[PDB]
Amino acid sequence: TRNGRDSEAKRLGVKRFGGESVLAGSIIVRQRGTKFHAGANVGCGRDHTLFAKADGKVKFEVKGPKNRKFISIEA
Amino acid sequence: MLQPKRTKFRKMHKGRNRGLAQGTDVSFGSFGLKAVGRGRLTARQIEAARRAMTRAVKRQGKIWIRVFPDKPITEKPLAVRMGKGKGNVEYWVALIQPGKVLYEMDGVPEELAREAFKLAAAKLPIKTTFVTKTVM
Amino acid sequence: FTINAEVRKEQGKGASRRLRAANKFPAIIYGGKEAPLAIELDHDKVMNMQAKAEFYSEVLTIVVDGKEIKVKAQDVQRHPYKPKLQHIDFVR
Amino acid sequence: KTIKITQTRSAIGRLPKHKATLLGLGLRRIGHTVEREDTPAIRGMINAVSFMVKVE
Amino acid sequence: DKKSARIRRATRARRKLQELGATRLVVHRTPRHIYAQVIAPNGSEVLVAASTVEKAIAEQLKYTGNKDAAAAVGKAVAERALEKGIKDVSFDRSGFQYHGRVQALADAAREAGLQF
RNA sequence: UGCCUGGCGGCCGUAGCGCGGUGGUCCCACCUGACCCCAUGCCGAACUCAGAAGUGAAACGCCGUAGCGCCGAUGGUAGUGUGGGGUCUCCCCAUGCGAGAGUAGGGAACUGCCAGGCAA
RNA sequence: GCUCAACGGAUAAAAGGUACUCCGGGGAUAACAGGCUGAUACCGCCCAAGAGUUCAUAUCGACGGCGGUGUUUGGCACCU
RNA sequence: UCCUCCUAAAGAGUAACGGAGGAGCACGAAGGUUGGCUAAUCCUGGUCGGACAUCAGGAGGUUAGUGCAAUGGCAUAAGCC
RNA sequence: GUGAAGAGGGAAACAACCCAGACCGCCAGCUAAGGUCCCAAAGUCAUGGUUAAGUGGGAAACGAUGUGGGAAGGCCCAGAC
Ligand SMILES: [Mg+2]
Ligand SMILES: [Mg+2]
Ligand SMILES: [Mg+2]
Ligand SMILES: [Mg+2]
Ligand SMILES: [Mg+2]
Ligand SMILES: [Mg+2]
Ligand SMILES: [Mg+2]
Ligand SMILES: [Mg+2]
Ligand SMILES: [Mg+2]
Ligand SMILES: [Mg+2]
Ligand SMILES: [Mg+2]
Ligand SMILES: [Mg+2]
Ligand SMILES: [Mg+2]
Ligand SMILES: [Mg+2]
Ligand SMILES: [Mg+2]
Ligand SMILES: [Mg+2]
Ligand SMILES: [Mg+2]
Ligand SMILES: [Mg+2]
Ligand SMILES: [Mg+2]
Ligand SMILES: [Mg+2]
Ligand SMILES: [Mg+2]
Ligand SMILES: [Mg+2]
Ligand SMILES: [Mg+2]
Ligand SMILES: [Mg+2]
Ligand SMILES: [Mg+2]
Ligand SMILES: [Mg+2]
Ligand SMILES: [Mg+2]
Ligand SMILES: [Mg+2]
Ligand SMILES: [Mg+2]
Ligand SMILES: [Mg+2]
Ligand SMILES: [Mg+2]
Ligand SMILES: [Mg+2]
Ligand SMILES: [Mg+2]
Ligand SMILES: [Mg+2]
Ligand SMILES: [Mg+2]
Ligand SMILES: [Mg+2]
Ligand SMILES: [Mg+2]
Ligand SMILES: [Mg+2]
Ligand SMILES: [Mg+2]
Ligand SMILES: [Mg+2]
Ligand SMILES: [Mg+2]
Ligand SMILES: [Mg+2]
Ligand SMILES: [Mg+2]
Ligand SMILES: [Mg+2]
Ligand SMILES: [Mg+2]
Ligand SMILES: [Mg+2]
Ligand SMILES: [Mg+2]
Ligand SMILES: [Mg+2]
Ligand SMILES: [Mg+2]
Ligand SMILES: [Mg+2]
Ligand SMILES: [Mg+2]
Ligand SMILES: [Mg+2]
Ligand SMILES: [Mg+2]
Ligand SMILES: [Mg+2]
Ligand SMILES: [Mg+2]
Ligand SMILES: [Mg+2]
Ligand SMILES: [Mg+2]
Ligand SMILES: [Mg+2]
Ligand SMILES: [Mg+2]
Ligand SMILES: [Mg+2]
Ligand SMILES: [Mg+2]
Ligand SMILES: [Mg+2]
Ligand SMILES: [Mg+2]
Ligand SMILES: [Mg+2]
Ligand SMILES: [Mg+2]
Ligand SMILES: [Mg+2]
Ligand SMILES: [Mg+2]
Ligand SMILES: [Mg+2]
Ligand SMILES: [Mg+2]
Ligand SMILES: [Mg+2]
Ligand SMILES: [Mg+2]
Ligand SMILES: [Mg+2]
Ligand SMILES: [Mg+2]
Ligand SMILES: [Mg+2]
Ligand SMILES: [Mg+2]
Ligand SMILES: [Mg+2]
Ligand SMILES: [Mg+2]
Ligand SMILES: [Mg+2]
Ligand SMILES: [Mg+2]
Ligand SMILES: [Mg+2]
Ligand SMILES: [Mg+2]
Ligand SMILES: [Mg+2]
Ligand SMILES: [Mg+2]
C-alpha cells in the first residue's frame, strides 16, 4: 500500500447545549472556524472556541443578515 | 466500452444497492426497457445489449442509454492473500434499482421495439420489461 | 368518465398499504377557496380509465357522498415497475 | 385512578431500556399482576413494552 | 454607490460598540446639515437628538454645514444629554473620518461636559 | 391624526432582482470653487474643507407590474424506532414517527424611537 | 545541547549464519491431508450478429447472461 | 511521531498492510493597532501590443484570496494596502 | 442479544437460532416457543377454497393450449371462430 495514516481525533463539538446552566468561563463549543458565532456574554478565543463570559444558561440563536448561528448567555 | 473520462477518486466503496429507482418515467423516446429486478450492470453488458438493439432495428430509429457506470469495481488478482491493499479497478458498473429505465427507443413500430428489446433483455442479468411513453 | 369514491378516515403509511393491498388506492381532490378532500377509490376502474388519452386533459366528475365534484387529474404516482397506479392528485 | 398491568413474556433477550422499563413499572417476573396509577407516563411505559405486557 | 460603502465602513464600530453595551453618540454628516443623537444601549430607542435641521439651532448661525455650525450642534447635544442624566457615552463616528466637522462636533461635545 | 423625508434598530429574500412610472416646497443627491485643516504611493476621482448658480439625469425614496428568485400546504411516496415474518445481498407486517422533491396556492414585505416639513 | 523519526525515548556504545544444532512452548501460526467457500477451473444451459452454394439453431456460434460440480489454481486458518 | 478529509451508522469516540493528501517550518513585518480598500474571468475601444503586460468603461458578483496539505471559517472582513 | 460463565422445552442430532433464567421437595393444575395419524404427550377436529408435482421434503436465467382465481378487450340470428 501507499497510504494508511490518520490524525488523532480532536474532540470538537458542542460541549454545552442550549438550556444548560454554565459557569463563567465554561467552554460551550470547541470548533475550527466560526460555524457558530459569539453573541451576548460569550467570548471567542484564538482557537475560535466559544466560552462563557458570565454565569447563566446557554442560548442558541439564528440571527443577522447572513442568517448565522449565534451563541448567547442570559442570566 | 462506457467509462467515466476522469474521476475524482480511483477506488470507490462497495455500498448497498437499496430502495427504488428514480429514472422511471420514459422521458426522451417513445418506448423503453425498464428494469423490474434489482442488480448492477457492467460496462460490457450495456454495450453488448446496445449492439443487440442497434443491429435488430438497423440504421433506422433512435436509441438512448439512460444508465451510465460511474462506479469502479476492484478485483483482486488470482493467487493473492487477503489484506495488503484494496484491489485494482477492473470494470465499471451502474447500480440498478427496481423501476429504472435502462434504454429508450424512438422512430420505430411498437412491434419491432419489443422484438429488439427482447434481444437486449437477454444480454442483461436483470429481469426487465417493455414500457411505453404515457403522456403524464 | 364518472369515477366513484369514498372518503378517507385513516391516512398515513400503514392505512395506505392496507388500502393499496385491497384493489383500491388513495387519492386527493383540491382547488379554489375550499379545503382539500382525501378520497379512497377502486383500482381496476381507474387503471382502465387512464388508457384513454382524454383522462389527462378532460374534466372528470368524481362521485363523493352523492356530490359530483368536477376535477382534472393534475399529478399521478406510478408504481415503480409493476403497471399500476399508487396515487392521483385531482386539481379543481 | 389505577390500571392493572400483567407481564406476559420474558425479559431475557431484550434491550437494556426494555429491562429498565419493566423495573420502572415494577414487573419482576412473567405472570405478575401489578397495579399502577394511570398517568400519561405509565401509558408511555406500557406503550414502550406493549409486546410483553397486558392491560386490564 | 458611496452610501453602502460608508455603511460597511462603520459596521465594525457599531457591532463592536453594541457588544460592550454602551450608550453611543451617532453623528450623521451631510454637505448641507449635520446630525447627532445619543442612543440607548439596547440600540432601538433615542434618548437625546439634535441637529442643524432643528430651527432652535438653525435660527442662530449663518450656515448649517461647517465647523462652527457643527460645534453649535456639539454643544446642543451635550447640554441636553446632561439634563436627561447621561454623561458616560461613546462616540460612533459612523464611517465619517474623524477630522473636520465631526471632530469639531466631538471637541465641542467634550468641552461642553459630556464624558468620553 | 394622515401624508412625506432623514438618522438609529428589530426582523433577515412572502422582505431580493429585472421591467414600468414618479418626487425636489424643506430634506437627500450630484453640483460650485480649493490661502487654509486634510488628501492622492499621479489625480480635490476618493477623503477633506469653504459654499448655494443649477438639476432630479445618475444615485436614492415611493407607487404599479409575476418575467425570475423566494415561501409553500393537504394527500401520497422514500426513510426509519420497537416486536414479528419471509421466497432473507433484499424486502414485508403490526404500531409510533414521517421526509425531500413535486403540486394547488401565497407572494413586489412588515414594524418600532427621536428629528424635520407640509394638510390640520 | 538528541531525524533518542522503532518519535512514552531499554545502553553513551551492537551486524550475520546454523542442513551440526539444542531447550521451552503453540495447531494462539505455516507446509501434507480434512473442513468452510467457489474468484479461478471443468461441466451444462439462455439470447442469435454471422459461417454453412440459398437457409441462425445438420455442424457451428460472436457480443453478453444464468446455473451445477467440489476433479484444478486459490482464499480462510476451524481439527491435528 | 504529528496535522486534514472519508470510512464513523446526524453529540464525542471508533478498527483494518481500508481510501486520498500534507508537516519536521515560515515571518521584526507576514505581529500590534489605527485608517482605508475589494476580488475572479470576460466583453468592447485603444500606440509599439499579439490570446495574455499597462489604461478606460461595462459585465459578474467571491468561481478569488488566505506564507504551506486538506477541512471548517472570514465583506464587521480573518482578504489586500 | 446470547454463549463464554445458563441448565430446562423446541429447531431429528446442533455452545451462539426460537422459547425461558434451575434455593429444595411433591406420582398436583394453567401456559411459552413448538406442536397434536403411528415411532412419541395431545384434533383421522369444524367451516370455504387451492394443489395431482410425493410439490410439501434444496436452486437461477429462460422455456410451455399445467391449473385456479380475477379485471378488461376482439364477433354473431345480416349465423364469426
Ligand atoms: Mg504490495
Ligand atoms: Mg497501524
Ligand atoms: Mg482514527
Ligand atoms: Mg479526523
Ligand atoms: Mg473527523
Ligand atoms: Mg485573548
Ligand atoms: Mg458506506
Ligand atoms: Mg440511489
Ligand atoms: Mg506459490
Ligand atoms: Mg403517521
Ligand atoms: Mg411501518
Ligand atoms: Mg444482563
Ligand atoms: Mg459624498
Ligand atoms: Mg443584478
Ligand atoms: Mg464635488
Ligand atoms: Mg430616473
Ligand atoms: Mg427599493
Ligand atoms: Mg403613496
Ligand atoms: Mg408598497
Ligand atoms: Mg420550500
Ligand atoms: Mg414540503
Ligand atoms: Mg405529508
Ligand atoms: Mg427489529
Ligand atoms: Mg427484523
Ligand atoms: Mg409466525
Ligand atoms: Mg416454497
Ligand atoms: Mg433475518
Ligand atoms: Mg422525483
Ligand atoms: Mg398581489
Ligand atoms: Mg417580491
Ligand atoms: Mg421593486
Ligand atoms: Mg551533549
Ligand atoms: Mg531506532
Ligand atoms: Mg520503541
Ligand atoms: Mg536502539
Ligand atoms: Mg513506542
Ligand atoms: Mg522503549
Ligand atoms: Mg537510550
Ligand atoms: Mg531440518
Ligand atoms: Mg549444539
Ligand atoms: Mg549439545
Ligand atoms: Mg522441541
Ligand atoms: Mg489453528
Ligand atoms: Mg497471534
Ligand atoms: Mg499443494
Ligand atoms: Mg490446507
Ligand atoms: Mg459448495
Ligand atoms: Mg446450438
Ligand atoms: Mg469452437
Ligand atoms: Mg468462443
Ligand atoms: Mg480467527
Ligand atoms: Mg476431530
Ligand atoms: Mg501514539
Ligand atoms: Mg463522522
Ligand atoms: Mg452516531
Ligand atoms: Mg461523530
Ligand atoms: Mg477497537
Ligand atoms: Mg487505521
Ligand atoms: Mg508522508
Ligand atoms: Mg496573515
Ligand atoms: Mg480595519
Ligand atoms: Mg476559494
Ligand atoms: Mg485552502
Ligand atoms: Mg482579530
Ligand atoms: Mg492581519
Ligand atoms: Mg432481538
Ligand atoms: Mg441451553
Ligand atoms: Mg436445547
Ligand atoms: Mg433437544
Ligand atoms: Mg421443524
Ligand atoms: Mg420453526
Ligand atoms: Mg436441523
Ligand atoms: Mg422435523
Ligand atoms: Mg430430541
Ligand atoms: Mg444450532
Ligand atoms: Mg432464579
Ligand atoms: Mg393446558
Ligand atoms: Mg401456540
Ligand atoms: Mg419430544
Ligand atoms: Mg398420541
Ligand atoms: Mg415450504
Ligand atoms: Mg417464459
Ligand atoms: Mg400455462
GROMACS .gro file of N, CA and C in nm, chain D residues 15-35:
model
   63
  318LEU      N    1  -3.382  -0.543   2.519
  318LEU     CA    2  -3.291  -0.427   2.528
  318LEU      C    3  -3.280  -0.378   2.673
  319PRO      N    4  -3.165  -0.317   2.710
  319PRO     CA    5  -3.148  -0.264   2.847
  319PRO      C    6  -3.256  -0.162   2.886
  320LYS      N    7  -3.299  -0.082   2.789
  320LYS     CA    8  -3.416   0.006   2.804
  320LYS      C    9  -3.543  -0.072   2.838
  321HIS      N   10  -3.566  -0.185   2.771
  321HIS     CA   11  -3.684  -0.269   2.797
  321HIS      C   12  -3.674  -0.347   2.929
  322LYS      N   13  -3.553  -0.386   2.967
  322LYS     CA   14  -3.528  -0.441   3.101
  322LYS      C   15  -3.549  -0.334   3.209
  323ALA      N   16  -3.509  -0.210   3.179
  323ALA     CA   17  -3.529  -0.097   3.270
  323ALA      C   18  -3.676  -0.059   3.285
  324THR      N   19  -3.747  -0.045   3.173
  324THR     CA   20  -3.890  -0.006   3.172
  324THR      C   21  -3.977  -0.095   3.261
  325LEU      N   22  -3.949  -0.225   3.261
  325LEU     CA   23  -4.016  -0.321   3.350
  325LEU      C   24  -3.982  -0.296   3.497
  326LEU      N   25  -3.857  -0.257   3.524
  326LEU     CA   26  -3.815  -0.217   3.659
  326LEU      C   27  -3.880  -0.085   3.701
  327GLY      N   28  -3.908   0.002   3.604
  327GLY     CA   29  -3.984   0.125   3.625
  327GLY      C   30  -4.134   0.106   3.642
  328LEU      N   31  -4.190   0.004   3.576
  328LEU     CA   32  -4.329  -0.038   3.602
  328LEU      C   33  -4.341  -0.115   3.734
  329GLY      N   34  -4.237  -0.190   3.768
  329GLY     CA   35  -4.235  -0.277   3.887
  329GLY      C   36  -4.268  -0.423   3.858
  330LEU      N   37  -4.251  -0.465   3.732
  330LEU     CA   38  -4.279  -0.603   3.690
  330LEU      C   39  -4.152  -0.686   3.704
  331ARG      N   40  -4.158  -0.788   3.789
  331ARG     CA   41  -4.040  -0.866   3.829
  331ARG      C   42  -4.024  -0.991   3.743
  332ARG      N   43  -4.131  -1.070   3.735
  332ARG     CA   44  -4.133  -1.193   3.656
  332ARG      C   45  -4.260  -1.198   3.570
  333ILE      N   46  -4.260  -1.288   3.472
  333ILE     CA   47  -4.380  -1.315   3.391
  333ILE      C   48  -4.495  -1.366   3.479
  334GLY      N   49  -4.616  -1.319   3.451
  334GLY     CA   50  -4.734  -1.352   3.531
  334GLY      C   51  -4.736  -1.282   3.666
  335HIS      N   52  -4.710  -1.151   3.665
  335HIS     CA   53  -4.713  -1.067   3.785
  335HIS      C   54  -4.811  -0.952   3.759
  336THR      N   55  -4.927  -0.957   3.826
  336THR     CA   56  -5.036  -0.862   3.802
  336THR      C   57  -5.023  -0.736   3.890
  337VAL      N   58  -4.928  -0.650   3.855
  337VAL     CA   59  -4.901  -0.526   3.929
  337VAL      C   60  -5.001  -0.418   3.886
  338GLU      N   61  -5.043  -0.333   3.981
  338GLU     CA   62  -5.134  -0.222   3.952
  338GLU      C   63  -5.071  -0.086   3.983
   0.00000   0.00000   0.00000
